[PDB]
Design a binder for this molecule. Structure first.
Ligand SMILES: CN(C(=O)N[C@@H]1COCC1(F)F)[C@@H](COc1ccccc1)c1cc[n+]([C@@H]2O[C@H](COP(=O)(O)OP(=O)(O)OC[C@@H]3O[C@@H](n4cnc5c(N)ncnc54)[C@H](O)[C@@H]3O)[C@@H](O)[C@H]2O)cc1
Ligand SMILES: CN(C(=O)N[C@@H]1COCC1(F)F)[C@@H](COc1ccccc1)c1cc[n+]([C@@H]2O[C@H](COP(=O)(O)OP(=O)(O)OC[C@H]3O[C@@H](n4cnc5c(N)ncnc54)[C@H](O)[C@@H]3O)[C@@H](O)[C@H]2O)cc1
Lengths: 140, 140
């Protein structure tokens, strides 16, 4: 029922993810971010259904955002889990690049390596309105 | 003419500072932040005029936000200059605390120790709108 899911890393991406939420809602999108819209019940189900329900998966690539996905053999890391769901479901994946270094794909789990083939949007501190505009152009 | 001046550290606080700006604009307040409002001319002049011009001074205390203030005995650091300006002008100072560890006064320059005597607001990741509502209570 939301159009946009926001996947982010708390310890480096929380503030950016929130700013993305606020801007997109301003522009008429219904947005899921965990802190606003993850409510009662077993969260493993709710989180994954929430990815499945949104056309758009916006992924915040703050510095090191994918480091916990590395060597996540049992799929216990939540950004890992969200990306796989977005990939499996063929979502409109929009990476947002905020000081991220592109790792060699093979440091990532096979089931999320394809995340790096989607075109991302550089988050510009100096030109935020234009960044926001570009993100809206990408959204389906 | 701006009602609110946002002073912040770029390396740790740029996202929060932009998040705060949007929320305050949505609530009808005119906000200076550099990356939107600092325009042509000598920036030393224009910034200081901007602090002097705004009833309210929102200071973003991201972690280590005052580190480059300490031992800054010549007032070269920009967060130091902004604070000193807001103090001298008797501005409504509003600290926003986001993982900031409170320092002993003695480690700060004498000219800006008084900033620690102001009542600050805890930035809550889980209750952002409540945080924003409290900030607006503080503002004049
Ligand atoms: C004039 N400057 C700009 O960045 N101008 C940009 C153009 O319009 C928008 C804009 F503001 F972003 C900078 C000036 O730097 C210094 C710093 C020391 C000595 C001389 C200049 C600016 C401005 C404002 N604040 C205030 O303080 C706080 C941030 O302080 P700090 O986190 O510690 O910031 P810093 O990272 O040490 O400064 C970074 C510098 O900022 C840029 N940059 C430096 N030179 C100039 C210059 N000539 N013209 C344009 N940009 C300049 C370069 O990126 C440098 O890296 C905030 O509250 C701000 O209000 C600090 C530095
Ligand atoms: C259900 N959890 C919540 O945080 N719930 C909060 C209450 O409602 C709103 C809310 F979401 F903020 C967490 C669950 O954590 C884990 C983590 C590992 C194993 C089991 C549970 C959640 C949820 C969503 N995301 C998604 O992923 C990304 C964030 O990933 P990371 O930065 O890496 O995340 P983390 O911060 O390391 O999470 C662990 C922390 O999460 C909290 N916390 C853990 N337990 C629960 C729990 N039972 N109920 C509430 N909070 C819980 C504690 O603060 C833990 O330290 C985003 O894209 C999110 O969509 C990750 C973790």
């Amino acid at each position: 029922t939301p159009d946009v899911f926001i996947s982010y890393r708390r310890n480096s991406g929380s503030q950016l993810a929130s700013l993305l939420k606020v801007h997109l809602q301003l522009h008429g999108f219904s947005v899921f971010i965990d802190v606003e819209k993850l409510e009662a019940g077993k969260f493993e189900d709710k989180l994954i259904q929430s990815v499945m329900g949104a056309r758009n998966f916006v992924l915040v690539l703050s510095p090191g955002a994918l480091d916990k996905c590395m060597q996540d053999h049992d799929c216990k890391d939540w950004v890992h889990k969200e990306i796989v769901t977005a990939l499996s479901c063929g979502k409109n994946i929009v990476p947002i690049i905020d000081g991220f270094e592109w790792p060699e794909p093979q440091v990532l789990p096979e089931d999320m390596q394809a995340v790096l083939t989607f075109n991302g949007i550089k988050w510009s501190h100096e030109y935020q309105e234009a960044t926001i505009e570009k993100i809206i152009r990408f959204l389906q």
